[PDB]
Amino acid sequence: SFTEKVASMAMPALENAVETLFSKDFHLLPALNAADLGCAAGPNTFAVISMIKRMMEKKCRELYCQTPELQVYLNDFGNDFNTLFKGLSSEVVGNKCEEVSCYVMGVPGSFHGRLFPRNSLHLVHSSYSVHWLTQAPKGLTSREGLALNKGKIYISKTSPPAVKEAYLSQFHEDFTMFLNARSQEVVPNGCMVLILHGRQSSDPSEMESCFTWELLAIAIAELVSQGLIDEDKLDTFNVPSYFPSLEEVKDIVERDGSFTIDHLEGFELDSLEMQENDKWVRGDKFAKMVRAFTEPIISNQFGHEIMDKLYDKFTHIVVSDLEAELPKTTSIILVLSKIVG
Amino acid sequence: SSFTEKVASMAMPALENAVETLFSKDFHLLPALNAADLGCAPNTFAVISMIKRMMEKKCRELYCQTPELQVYLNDLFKCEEVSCYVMGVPGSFHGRLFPRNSLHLVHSSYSVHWLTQAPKGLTSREGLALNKGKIYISKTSPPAVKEAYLSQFHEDFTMFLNARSQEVVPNGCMVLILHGRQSSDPSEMESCFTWELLAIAIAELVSQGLIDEDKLDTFNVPSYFPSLEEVKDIVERDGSFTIDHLEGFELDSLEMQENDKWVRGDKFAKMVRAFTEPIISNQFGHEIMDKLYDKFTHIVVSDLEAELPKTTSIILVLSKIV
């Protein structure tokens, strides 16, 4: 739903990044090597790979040389990528019309560190993965940091300055780790198309920046007051995720020397299906998406036998307390090129 | 898989001799070495450590930067020197899996003998099944069967070789191990004991009215156990690879270090059921499988006194030609 809208918004940035690769004759290499990192997109992963497939086919059809092939690395691969495998594998598709063969591989492991040999990647795509951290900020998980962000699970208006500082610091570290890892693996002049969950305002405590996590904390606090969750637990737990601003992303990429910013863009989208007339169906659909992306870290924290009652309260807060309206979600599009190198 | 365990110890010398022959050429100071395990089924995780161990030794002798190792795994069923990255490759190994010129090494153990399908031409005209009472080449079976089977294996193995030809780099190495046979006649008990016995078990249930004969008569396994000569000829017909070594070795089929025949027979049947039931179950259901391998075990433990012929494995070492 929302994911679909984000994916289409980033598609032109993906096209141009392929175009730039062509201007450096990447289409004349024996094979183009593409990776999709954090394949949790996705469904929307099929569109981006089909798009690379198609742009190569258009480019190479007038070339006298033997037609280049496409090698696709998919990471997150949980064996459910079979729908993408069967849809993109040119041997499985069996289309004799296609001149560009596509070979699809699974890459196990974390997008945070190394996944491939040196100079093995020409193009990296990653959508809504890079804002995830390796852990809750270290300054928040020390013996005395467990006390800083009391009734919440993320940067909030109630958070002392140390909280957002810790998060930015953790992001700086984890994102630089990523950049460093990719820098080893992305070929000189290679491209990277990153899309992530960010924010508009410079202040992270702003609702538009934190609403999803703020509302979840309010829901957890409800069950806490009702005596169903230990609060222990609320006060010591913080989310392993950060939504940076444009400026923060720029800063970190520029401090790291490895990549050049070809494109840095933010854009806003509605956070719920505003075309939906049923105020309950609107929030329920939103909550379902939220649950799909957040239940792993959350149920791990509070147990699974409380996830139903928890996400129900979350939906009730969205529907009733907020009249099925939320601030708009900001997404960041970051296109990078590996410097030579 | 205590049997497989013994097979991989015997082919590991032939794996070392071959991987090291990729160090005689250079082929020594490259960025990253790409190796594929095609039809994996812990031994695939053993051949990986072998490659890593060998590479690190040849580099420390050559005083050069250590390449990284990328391993591709196509599934059918701290102070380490060489950086290894492992990748999963879905898809059939009889077709293309990799870009051209991308593999330095290919390993495949006990997968190549599996056919893409049970042989095509097994019905006459008339309109009779050409392999009644059985599920593989047998003594009762007319010549047409073993010819259909060899033809199917010819086609399938040649497709494999053909695909690999595109992907294996010039002078790149292929190590293939497969279930073969000693005797030139593929209907010898040495060649087909497992399938023969399985048929005998099924035919027992048929006479008891538990399984249609329909059924037995129209089913045949998607497997073929070739001879050294058949393997050699097919490889030579295809023009892509050089036969560096081609050798067969014998192995005891049952755990013979066990005096209790019914125990060593069960162990055998348990093993046989693990790799044959998925091949058999579509045609005969899972329902009758308990009574099927029950009867199979009695045919093994009683009628043959837990004495089965040795299994022949073929070790095939290849090099890409240009």
Residue numbers in the entry:
A (entry chain B): 29 to 104, 106 to 370
B (entry chain A): 28 to 68, 71 to 106, 125 to 369
The authors write:
Here, we identified three N-methyltransferases involved in the biosynthesis of caffeine from the leaves of Kucha. Combined with enzymatic study and kinetic analysis, we found that one of the N-methyltransferases, CkTcS, serves as the critical N9-methyltransferase, which only acts on 1,3,7-trimethyluric acid but not caffeine, indicating that C8-oxidation must take place prior to N9-methylation. The structural characterization of CkTcS identified key residues around the substrate binding pocket that are critical for N9-methyltransferse activity. A previous study using 14C labeled caffeine has confirmed that theacrine is biosynthesized from caffeine, possibly initiated by oxidation at C8 to yield the intermediate 1,3,7-trimethyluric acid followed by N9-methylation.
We next asked why CkTcS prefers 5, given the fact that it shares a sequence identity >90% with CkTbS and CkCS. We tried to solve the structure of CkTbS and CkCS in the presence of SAH and their corresponding substrates, but only crystallized CkTbS. Unfortunately, the N-terminal cap domain of CkTbS is disordered due to crystal packing. We finally solved the structure of CkTbS in apo form. However, when overlapping the CkTbS and CkTcS structures, most residues lining the substrate binding pockets are in the same orientation, suggesting that substrate binding does not induce large conformational changes in the methyltransferase domain. The substrate specificity of CkTcS proteins might be determined by minor variable residues which subtly tailor the chemical features of the core catalytic scaffold. Further observation identified three sequence-variable residues around the pocket: CkTcS_Arg-226 (CkTbS_His-226, CkCS_Arg-225), CkTcS_Ile-241 (CkTbS_Thr-241, CkCS_Thr-240), and CkTcS_Cys-270 (CkTbS_Ser-270, CkCS_Ser-269). In CkTbS and CkCS, Ile-241 is replaced by a threonine, and Cys-270 by a serine, both of which contain hydrophilic side-chains that may introduce extra direct or water-mediated hydrogen-bond and influence substrate binding. Consistently, CkTbS H226R mutation led to an apparent increase of N9-methylation activity towards 5. Single mutation of T241I or C270S on CkTbS led to a moderate increase in reaction products, while the double and triple mutations further increased the N-methyltransferase activity to almost half of that of CkTcS.
